[PDB]
Structures are given as structure tokens and as C-alpha cells.
Write a protein that binds this ligand. Structure first.
Ligand SMILES: OC[C@H]1O[C@@H](O[C@H]2[C@H](O)[C@@H](O)[C@H](O[C@H]3[C@H](O)[C@@H](O)[C@H](O[C@H]4[C@H](O)[C@@H](O)[C@@H](O)O[C@@H]4CO)O[C@@H]3CO)O[C@@H]2CO)[C@H](O)[C@@H](O)[C@@H]1O
Ligand SMILES: [Ca+2]
Ligand SMILES: [Ca+2]
Length: 602
């Protein structure tokens, strides 16, 4: 077992240039001496600590150890505190080189090939023989799904609103997380995040770099003429298309998009996609899913126009058919359902879709330039909006957006792409984004472990489900700020956010698989779960954990830690802790956006 260094640092390392502040565990409030040592032991730098006191989220007495000035490349740098009488008066070995996120950006996007449904996971692409597996859900027993998935049984206690009895082929798409579900909601932001990082590379001019080019990713679409990152994105878009309801299926709601499709009931950990024996069904349909659809398909329409005109055009034509249907049924909300004992997939419920509408409008406007999308876009409560603090479940949480609080996603599209909105408004939008980043930049300075989020305002406070993802989305908006201003403070903010995710935290935990001295090793996943049975393999690298969640929303974290544990410590790296150690598409997408960004800024 690993001791836990008194000096918390990024367990992998730092880019030679930029803000660098470790966090020490020192009740000894009074500047204590430190000293950066190279692998050999020689003190290549030194100074004193900065007493910050009792940190509210971690219940730790801490000091900051700013060493931003230092920028000398090398392997094995480890801090120390000669005066301190602690058996752990130090930091894990780390690096200061240019290629910290060079490989990590690919690993992160590889997560999406791995979670692909309806296709075999084969060698080269898998990165290892042990991650190979049969296609998941292609109608071959024991699977009972996706080629002919019927609508949810009506007599079911959680059947949701009534549906007609029919079947669809909804093969393909990505698995959401540790489960075998496929959700349009949550899938929407995930896929928007990959296409957006691409569009950003294009407009800036580096779309001919890394994963943005044909042959940039170790996926089967390596040299098919299209940009690799979009091939992945299209995999999910192809699945969205199949989820849209047709005239022959149900006239009352044609053009609308089924909320999600998954197992009738929950299966246990320790299973591969093709082994899932559960009956498979289609959830009801929801304005939000219809709008995520309209939005990502519009975005897809303008990005694929140069490569595959036929595909790009059908995307747009479907996006509009969905936007239109959403106006006629603007208030069908996916309702809540238990997390255990009920439907075999998460609910992703939301009773507010104004933002979604705003989002779809922003994407449709920039793509079609039509008046109707412009009039909505502008006369909206969310016009040019960009939260720093949201506010159903997201109210008072801290962060710019989530799978359910979508305004902001659209706003980013307005602040980065063509469109003929008064150049004046575009300016506000870009300012709001920088404002938003400033607030978070503050949170970091008042935070002991320099993380951009503070506990929730929802009175219960603490860190929410998948907190880490909030830090991630924040880093994206920050990233744009450094684009619109050039003020390296926004970049240093990112440097703090990611440092937290990689080890400078109250758990001395690297929430990313395959990275750090204490890497994330037991995510809640049905395939990569060594703890369930040695039969299954440790997971691939570059996948991030949801992190701390002080709502004790799973048995394991309930039995593993006291009832009063500090929010930033409410975590356990155990495959059973689904509320604290799970992996998803809406978390690895933003984690990828961010790792890519940090690799270019270098
Ligand atoms: O508060 C809502 C929260 O949802 C987050 O998304 C969740 C998604 O909604 C949920 O479907 C899934 O978490 C699943 C987990 O994958 C699944 O394996 C597990 O199933 C258990 C079962 O409950 C047990 O009874 C027993 O049978 O074992 C199985 C397998 O271990 O159930 C959980 C949910 O109950 O993952 C998504 C990602 O976290 C949103 O991200 C968040 O923002 C929302 O607040
Ligand atoms: Ca390609
Ligand atoms: Ca919403």
C-alpha cells in the first residue's frame, strides 16, 4: 500500500512553463522549509511554504508550495521538507517535460472505441489483446437486442408514458458507462464535446494535427478519407438517427427521439456486452433527447459537409424534423426511476428544457443561418448565457454545463463560429465566458487543493455525483477564455484543475486510469473489473473517475467511510462504488477535449 505524501503534486508531472502550486499537509501553520530535489538527491531548488490553514472541503491544515518559477526538464523530481518530522514529508516522484499529455490525449479518445456497441473490439485498435471482445448487441443470443428492440412493456410499473408497440433496430452507438445502456441524453453532450474540440481545431487551423486528421486515431476508420475524431463522433450520430421515430411507427410523435434503450432490469458486474441476457427495450421519448438530437445533428451537418455531403445533408434534414417535433411536444420529460430495483438503466430525468431549445437553436442557426432559429436564439432567457454556477439537480452546483443543463454549450458555438449575430452580442458571449472563468479562478485561490469548484449551494452541499466532470467542463470554458484573451491566468487555471485530477487532492489519488503512482485501478465497469473476478482485465489508460460524491449514493462508499467524511474525501477506488468510481462518455469526452488542449498549448 502507498503511504500518501505530505506534499501533494501532479503525480505525472508539469509542463515546463506555467503556474505550479503543490499542496502540503501541514497543521504546523508557520512557513516551513521545502526543497525540490532531482532524482539524484541534490537540492536543485528550495524555499518556504504558504500557510493557508484549515481547508473546509478536506479538513486538512494546508500550505501552498508555489514553484512556478522553476522550469527545468527532468525525470524524478520530488519535493521534501527537512524540518518536518513526518515519515511522509515529501511528494511522489514527478516530471517536468513537454509531452505530459501527448499520449494521454489519445488514450482518452480510445475510451470511445472501447465502449462501441455493435462492432467487435479487435486487435490493433484495442491496444492490447486482453481488451478484445465480441460485438455487443447484434441480436445474437444471449443478447436480445438492438437489431429488434421493442418499445417498453406498458404493464411495467415504471413503463413511463404509454407507447405504441413496435420495434426498431438501434445497433451501434456507445455504451454510456459501466453499463450497457445507450442514452441520447448524456450521449448528446459527450458527442458534442468531441465534435466541438474538432471544430475548434479546424477554425484555429490545427485540424491537421493529432487526432483531428484521417489516420490520427488507432481506430478501424484510420484511412477512409475522413477526419478520425469525426469517425468516432459519427458512430454515435448513426445511433441517434435510428432512435428518431418515424411516421409508420407513431404519427402522434413522429420526428421525436426515444430517450434511451437498455436492459429491462440491472445485470451484475462481471459481464461482456454479448453476454448480457436481459430483455432490451426502448424508453418513451423526450423533448430533451429530441433536442440533443437536433443539436448534435446540426453540428454534425456543418462539420461533415466537406467530407461526406450525403451524410452531412441527411443530418441537417433530420435535425430540423426533430426541432419541429420538439416544438409540438416541448414538454415531454423523462421521469425519475430508482437507481436499483427498477429499469435496467439510469433515468437522466429533467423537467426543464428551455436551455436544450436554446442549444439546438444555436447549433441550427450557425449551420443554416435561418431566421427562425435566430429569433428563438435571441429572444431566449439564455441568450449569450454562460454559467459559473448553475440553477433541477444542477441548481447551485458550480460549473458551466452538464448533460442536463445545456445552455452554454450553444453559447460556446455562438462565440466560436461564423453566424451573423450582431458582432456586439458575440462580444458579450465571449466576455461572459471569461467572467465565468474568473469566478472559478477565484474558487481555486480560496480552495486548499486549488480546484475550481466549491461545495454546492443546494444545502446538503458537499461534492456531487461525478464532481471531477464539473472540473473538466470548467477547464474547457477556461480554455476558450485563453483563446479570447491570451491571458495566461486562464491557462494556469486549467493547470490547477488538471493537477487536482492527477494527484494534488485530499486522497493523493490519480482519478485517471494508467497514470500516476497511485492510479485509478478499480472503476465501476462491467468488463474492466479485476475485483469482481481475476477473469477480467484492468482497464485501458486515460479513463477518468467521477470522483468524490458526498451523498453516499452507493452501498460501498457507505460502508467504507464514516458519515461525516469531508466532501473531497468521499471517494473509494472500488469497482462496486458506482456513485463514486464510475466512468462515462460525458466525462471522458470533456477529459479528452482538455488533454488535447493542454498538448497543443505546448
Ligand atoms: O443521480 C443521477 C445521476 O446519474 C448519473 O448518470 C449515471 C447513470 O444514470 C446510471 O445509469 C449509471 O450508474 C449505474 C451503474 O452503471 C449500474 O451498474 C448500477 O447497477 C447496479 C444495481 O443498481 C445494483 O442493484 C446491483 O444489481 O448491481 C448493479 C451493477 O453494479 O446502477 C447505477 C445507478 O443506480 O451511470 C451513470 C454515470 O454516473 C449522472 O452522471 C449524474 O450527474 C446524475 O446526478
Ligand atoms: Ca478516418
Ligand atoms: Ca435541460
Amino acid at each position: 500500500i502507498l503511504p500518501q505524501p505530505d506534499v501533494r503534486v501532479n503525480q505525472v508531472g508539469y509542463l515546463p512553463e506555467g503556474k505550479k502550486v503543490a499542496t502540503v499537509v501541514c497543521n504546523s501553520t508557520q512557513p516551513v522549509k521545502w526543497q525540490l530535489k532531482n532524482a539524484a538527491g541534490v537540492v536543485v531548488l528550495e524555499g518556504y511554504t504558504e500557510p493557508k490553514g484549515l481547508d473546509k472541503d478536506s479538513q486538512d491544515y494546508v500550505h501552498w508550495l508555489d514553484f512556478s518559477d522553476f522550469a527545468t526538464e527532468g525525470i524524478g523530481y520530488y519535493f521534501e521538507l527537512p524540518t518536518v518530522n513526518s515519515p511522509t514529508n515529501y511528494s511522489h516522484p514527478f516530471d517536468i517535460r513537454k509531452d505530459i499529455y501527448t499520449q494521454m490525449k489519445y488514450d482518452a479518445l480510445a475510451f470511445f472505441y472501447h465502449k462501441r456497441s455493435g462492432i467487435p473490439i479487435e486487435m490493433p485498435y484495442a491496444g492490447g489483446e486482453q481488451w478484445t471482445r465480441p460485438a455487443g448487441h447484434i441480436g445474437i443470443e444471449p443478447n436480445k437486442g438492438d437489431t429488434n428492440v421493442p418499445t417498453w412493456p406498458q404493464d411495467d410499473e415504471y413503463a413511463g408514458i404509454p407507447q405504441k408497440n413496435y420495434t426498431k433496430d438501434v445497433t451501434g452507438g456507445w455504451y454510456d458507462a459501466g453499463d450497457h445502456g445507450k442514452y441520447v441524453v448524456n450521449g448528446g453532450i459527450a458527442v458534442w464535446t468531441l465534435m466541438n474540440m474538432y471544430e475548434r481545431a479546424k477554425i484555429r487551423g490545427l485540424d491537421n494535427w493529432g487526432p483531428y486528421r484521417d489516420g490520427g486515431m488507432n481506430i478501424p476508420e484510420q484511412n477512409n478519407g475522413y477526419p478520425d475524431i469525426l469517425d468516432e463522433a459519427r458512430w454515435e450520430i448513426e445511433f441517434f438517427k435510428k432512435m428518431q421515430v418515424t411516421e409508420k411507427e407513431d404519427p402522434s410523435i413522429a420526428g421525436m427521439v426515444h430517450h434511451k434503450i437498455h436492459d429491462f432490469r440491472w445485470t451484475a458486474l462481471g459481464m461482456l456486452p454479448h453476454e448480457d441476457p436481459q430483455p432490451r427495450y426502448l424508453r418513451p421519448v423526450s423533448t430533451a433527447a429530441t433536442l440533443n438530437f437536433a443539436a448534435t445533428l446540426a453540428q454534425s451537418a456543418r462539420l461533415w459537409k466537406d467530407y461526406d455531403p450525403t451524410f452531412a445533408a441527411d443530418c441537417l434534414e433530420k435535425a430540423e424534423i426533430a426541432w419541429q417535433a420538439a416544438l409540438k411536444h416541448p414538454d415531454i420529460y423523462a421521469e425519475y426511476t430508482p437507481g436499483s430495483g427498477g429499469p435496467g438503466g439510469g433515468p437522466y430525468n429533467d423537467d426543464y428544457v428551455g436551455d436544450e431549445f436554446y442549444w439546438a437553436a444555436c447549433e441550427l442557426y450557425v449551420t443554416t443561418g435561418k431566421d427562425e432559429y435566430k429569433n428563438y436564439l435571441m429572444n431566449s432567457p439564455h441568450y449569450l448565457e454562460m454559467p459559473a454556477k448553475m440553477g433541477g439537480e444542477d441548481n447551485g452546483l458550480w460549473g458551466c454545463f452538464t448533460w442536463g443543463t445545456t445552455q452554454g454549450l450553444g453559447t460556446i458555438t455562438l462565440a466560436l463560429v461564423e453566424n451573423g449575430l450582431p458582432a456586439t452580442d458575440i462580444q458579450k458571449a465571449r466576455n461572459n465566458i471569461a467572467k465565468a472563468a474568473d469566478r472559478w479562478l477565484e474558487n481555486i485561490e480560496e480552495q486548499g487543493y486549488r480546484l475550481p469548484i466549491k461545495q454546492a449551494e443546494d444545502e446538503r452541499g458537499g461534492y456531487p455525483w461525478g464532481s471531477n466532470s464539473f472540473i473538466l467542463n470548467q477547464m474547457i470554458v477556461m480554455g476558450y477564455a485563453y483563446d479570447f484573451t491570451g491571458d495566461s491566468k486562464y491557462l494556469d487555471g486549467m493547470f490547477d484543475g488538471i493537477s487536482y485530477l492527477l494527484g494534488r487532492n485530499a486522497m493523493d489519488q490519480s482519478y485517471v486510469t494508467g497514470y500516476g503512482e497511485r492510479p485509478l485501478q478499480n472503476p465501476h465497469d462491467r468488463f474492466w473489473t479485476p475485483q469482481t473476478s481475476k477473469r477480467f482485465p484492468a482497464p485501458p489508460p486515460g479513463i477518468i473517475s467521477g470522483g468524490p460524491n458526498s451523498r453516499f449514493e452507493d452501498p460501498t462508499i457507505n460502508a467504507a467511510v464514516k458519515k461525516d467524511t469531508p466532501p473531497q474525501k468521499c471517494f473509494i477506488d472500488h469497482t462496486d462504488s458506482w456513485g463514486t468510481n464510475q466512468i462515462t462518455v460525458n466525462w471522458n469526452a470533456p477529459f479528452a477535449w482538455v488533454t488535447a488542449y493542454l498538448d497543443e498549448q505546448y
